[PDB]
Design a protein around this ligand. Sequence first.
Ligand SMILES: [Ca+2]
Ligand SMILES: [Ca+2]
Ligand SMILES: [Ca+2]
Ligand SMILES: [Zn+2]
Ligand SMILES: [Zn+2]
Lengths: 169, 158
Amino acid sequence: IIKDILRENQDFRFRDLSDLKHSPKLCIITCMDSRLIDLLERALGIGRGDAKVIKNAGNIVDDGVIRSAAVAIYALGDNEIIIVGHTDCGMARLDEDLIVSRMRELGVEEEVIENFSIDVLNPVGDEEENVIEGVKRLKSSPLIPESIGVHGLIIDINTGRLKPLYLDE
Amino acid sequence: IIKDILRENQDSPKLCIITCMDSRLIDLLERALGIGRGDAKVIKNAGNIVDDGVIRSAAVAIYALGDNEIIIVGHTDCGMARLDEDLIVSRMRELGVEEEVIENFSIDVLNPVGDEEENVIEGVKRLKSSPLIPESIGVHGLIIDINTGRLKPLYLDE
Ligand SMILES: [Ca+2]
Ligand SMILES: [Ca+2]
Ligand SMILES: [Ca+2]
Ligand SMILES: [Zn+2]
Ligand SMILES: [Zn+2]
């Protein structure tokens, strides 16, 4: 039997926690904000190999996020997702006009500018509501099994203190 | 700062890094690039694939957050280049996912084309050809060894 154990082991790979049976299989969804680098990891007690991480502007759950989370679930065994918003994000406070002025400045086609406006501007609530909304989207998605735990938290961008908004399980 | 980064690798922010969600990049990427808290906006998704979502986030960092340089960092041994479809379909069914969802998902995500390097290059081109990205924005492409942290340049702008 040792020969069969060795042959199978030559293909075994311990890449991260997903390759173990008793560790957390975590996926974190958060913002691209530079103040979250390092701080978020320490604040969550996370290190290398501890979680799959998705990041975009404002940690808004769109189709791309859902698809990446689904990859994490079906290919990497993730069974817990945590959206982490943060204070002083501002995606809930953009300067539409100033932004439009700059694009129009570099000659960006009006058609393009208009699309951008409807797609990224107008659509978005404030920090805590954006997180709750993201939780609802993930839980409502036919790509996300209900056996997956989905939590929503908001972190103080200066102190790292976490405030829970929604706790699943 | 792509120059400093490469030099550093031999061992407000104006920079935006686009990379993968792979857990092995946590902490390793920061030390490898010499990047820490407040040094860059960071966008991450499955396989650092540049899609409309990534482009819109990059556009926001540029037009609202004084962003003038983008670095796509792919990595070796990326799961998106070694997708086991049958194993994934099995997981989906076992978890009770409908057959319709499964089929649509396998076509939409389970058939990526291109290895890690090719994907980075394609990403550089998608950003370079996007109307939402000013031609004055520097767009670089690198690939990092997921175990050693060694960076290999694929495309350095200007
Ligand atoms: Ca459902
Ligand atoms: Ca449940
Ligand atoms: Ca190829
Ligand atoms: Zn933010
Ligand atoms: Zn990857």
